[PDB]
Enzyme design. Sequence first.
Site, PDB file in Angstrom:
ATOM      1  CG  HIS B 327      -2.098   0.892   1.108  1.00 25.29           C
ATOM      2  ND1 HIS B 327      -2.372   1.629  -0.023  1.00 25.29           N
ATOM      3  CD2 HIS B 327      -3.093   1.167   1.985  1.00 25.29           C
ATOM      4  CE1 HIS B 327      -3.482   2.321   0.162  1.00 25.29           C
ATOM      5  NE2 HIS B 327      -3.939   2.059   1.373  1.00 25.29           N
ATOM      6  N   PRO B 328       0.803   2.100  -1.017  1.00 22.69           N
ATOM      7  CG  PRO B 328       0.924   2.623  -3.256  1.00 22.69           C
ATOM      8  CD  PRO B 328       0.031   1.962  -2.260  1.00 22.69           C
ATOM      9  CG  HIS B 356       2.340  13.230  -6.502  1.00 24.76           C
ATOM     10  ND1 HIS B 356       2.078  14.183  -5.540  1.00 24.76           N
ATOM     11  CD2 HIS B 356       1.791  12.078  -6.051  1.00 24.76           C
ATOM     12  CE1 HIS B 356       1.413  13.626  -4.544  1.00 24.76           C
ATOM     13  NE2 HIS B 356       1.228  12.349  -4.828  1.00 24.76           N
ATOM     14  CD  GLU B 357       4.803   9.963  -4.913  1.00 27.51           C
ATOM     15  OE1 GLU B 357       3.945   9.416  -5.635  1.00 27.51           O
ATOM     16  OE2 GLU B 357       4.511  10.545  -3.850  1.00 27.51           O
ATOM     17  CD  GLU B 384      -4.393  11.745  -3.643  1.00 28.04           C
ATOM     18  OE1 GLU B 384      -4.311  12.646  -2.781  1.00 28.04           O
ATOM     19  OE2 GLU B 384      -3.573  10.806  -3.723  1.00 28.04           O
ATOM     20  CD1 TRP B 459     -30.545  -1.605  -1.518  1.00 27.36           C
ATOM     21  CD2 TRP B 459     -29.338  -0.643   0.103  1.00 27.36           C
ATOM     22  NE1 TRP B 459     -29.219  -1.701  -1.868  1.00 27.36           N
ATOM     23  CE2 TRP B 459     -28.458  -1.120  -0.888  1.00 27.36           C
ATOM     24  CE3 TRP B 459     -28.805  -0.001   1.225  1.00 27.36           C
ATOM     25  CZ2 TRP B 459     -27.073  -0.974  -0.791  1.00 27.36           C
ATOM     26  CZ3 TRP B 459     -27.429   0.143   1.319  1.00 27.36           C
ATOM     27  CH2 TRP B 459     -26.581  -0.342   0.317  1.00 27.36           C
ATOM     28  CE  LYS B 463     -30.791  -4.041  -6.243  1.00 28.83           C
ATOM     29  NZ  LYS B 463     -30.587  -4.113  -7.705  1.00 28.83           N
ATOM     30  CG  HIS B 487     -11.968   0.674   3.457  1.00 34.18           C
ATOM     31  ND1 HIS B 487     -11.331  -0.548   3.414  1.00 34.18           N
ATOM     32  CD2 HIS B 487     -11.115   1.563   2.896  1.00 34.18           C
ATOM     33  CE1 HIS B 487     -10.148  -0.405   2.843  1.00 34.18           C
ATOM     34  NE2 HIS B 487      -9.992   0.866   2.520  1.00 34.18           N
ATOM     35  CE1 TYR B 497     -10.736   8.510  -1.066  1.00 35.91           C
ATOM     36  CE2 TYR B 497      -9.999   8.695  -3.334  1.00 35.91           C
ATOM     37  CZ  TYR B 497      -9.849   8.174  -2.068  1.00 35.91           C
ATOM     38  OH  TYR B 497      -8.811   7.311  -1.804  1.00 35.91           O
TER      39      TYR B 497
END
Lengths: 85, 596
Positions: B327-328, B356-357, B384, B459, B463, B487, B497
């Site tokens: 995982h970076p 970017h790094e 990002e 739901w 849906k 998560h 995000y």
Amino acid sequence: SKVGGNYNYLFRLFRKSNLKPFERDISTEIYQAGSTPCNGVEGFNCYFPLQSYGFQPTNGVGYQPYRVVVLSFELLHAPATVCGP
Amino acid sequence: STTEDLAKTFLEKFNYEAEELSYQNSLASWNYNTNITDENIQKMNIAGAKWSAFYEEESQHAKTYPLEEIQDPIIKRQLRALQQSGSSVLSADKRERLNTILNAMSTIYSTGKACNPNNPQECLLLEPGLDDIMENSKDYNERLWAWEGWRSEVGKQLRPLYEEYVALKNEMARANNYEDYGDYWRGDYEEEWADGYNYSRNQLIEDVEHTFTQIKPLYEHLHAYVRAKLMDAYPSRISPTGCLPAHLLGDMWGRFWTNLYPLMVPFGQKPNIDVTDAMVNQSWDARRIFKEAEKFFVSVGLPNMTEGFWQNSMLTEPGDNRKVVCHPTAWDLGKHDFRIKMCTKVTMDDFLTAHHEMGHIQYDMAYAAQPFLLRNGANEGFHEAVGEIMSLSAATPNHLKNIGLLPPDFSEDSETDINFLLKQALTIVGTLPFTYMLEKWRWMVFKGEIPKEQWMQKWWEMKRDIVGVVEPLPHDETYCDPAALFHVANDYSFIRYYTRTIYQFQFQEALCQIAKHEGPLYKCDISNSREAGQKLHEMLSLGRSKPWTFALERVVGAKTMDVRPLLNYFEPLFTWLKEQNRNSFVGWNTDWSPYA
């Protein structure tokens, strides 16, 4: 810059007034600034005046140590101690 | 001394203490992911516990200092950063319920594996078989086995404590000392403040609607492409206008839509620019690639790496016997020793994402003079957004010829470039929707507005026909559609995000508006142009001297979203879309009951 690190440099924290050139104070009593006198109880604005440096081998470009040396002169009618070739 | 002044003395000391112990834990993490043995694990645990104990005694100290006779704004900012405190009083029972439930699902998720309903012999863990399928396999019984086995194997071990935890979610999201835990998943952004810049979740949701209404169709066609490649790989099942039956999902829960890429070809000649064999053949050397990183920031004035950077900064995976995750994780060891922990090899990741790094390093130096509370990126959303910018801008033959390696008369193949625009649009607009749905539910249950009965009917009837979801087997009221994800157990708020997406979206509007594009947001380049070089790099590098709203506005303009360059994508992609596959359409769904 040793691998374990060096924690052996330290400076002042608290004082009441400003100093004069070429002056030094050495008092190390518990610093108190509360109206209730500080009998010697740690905490409640009573601490240890010094604070260490905490150096390490891999410090950054801005934090890598430098050895400062000052060659000061006194310019009066005093006897001279400078020569040349 | 005033309370402000005594706390300022204690501030003058804990700044130094915090930098020291933060650096110590930084090398602790360095030894965490540079070598892995049991003694190392215990050492990182004890160091973390020690610094946490220091923070907790500082917290108890902070509770003692009052704030009412304090009249200093920036000093007060630092004081609040000091005075954040809490959580050392909960009783055994309730603390057990909450934290034990969370940690229990965490541990079983870590230590669980699955097997097969029909051929339980070839049965394997979460990683190998299932991800093997979603990366390489195109067999129906394979995918169907994946989904059904995982569901009927993992839900059975997660559900009962998690229904009692539906109740527990209600109680702790209501009780945990704050407004609500929907807005605490939105809580690092949660606002009850002042000073002129009131933009919040009201405008958030309203521009969610307006974002649909303007720039949904490209996400339409992207869904068409991915879901259609799958539907062709397993042909002859579905009617066009409506949604799809879902025994052919393609992933676990629909985190990304990237999982379903290749085959379908309305965008269909050759794929996007791939340079494995190009690097094999001509080999534009990577050392000169970092040298053009230097040069395209020396037209703006930025340095290179050092020997110590070569020694420390590790970009790939260790790859050796070391048991570490690939995982970076963007890193910095502090003390100006900005190092990195990614999984980065010599690829487009190297060139662009390592611009970017190395820009992580340069950006750290850009805010290296900040005070204690500001030594971090001004925003992880910046990282990002500008990473996307850097990828799409430095992945350019015009840059490669401005350094003098390619000719300047390049012609391209329509359908292939069109694939590349396909994928880019996919990510950019496909971020939000399903997470929007679950976040609506989570918002108003963590505020307590859903009663304990309408969950699943809601739901389904959210849906098939409002805005779009799909899921095959009926998750009845006993199961916890409200929460079934590791998560969510790991407090990785996704919707941030989209928040940074719209932020950066209109930020790009304003920024490349100052840069003066002719049309759309790409080709906003910098190379060997001194005036543009200052006018975007000194533009992007400001600092953190003022509040967050002032900083973001002064830096990068307005507080809205784009349509002009995405519209100047659309209309030209509309014409091209015509000339190859002129039959685009409209639709998003959410009001179902499919399998029943």
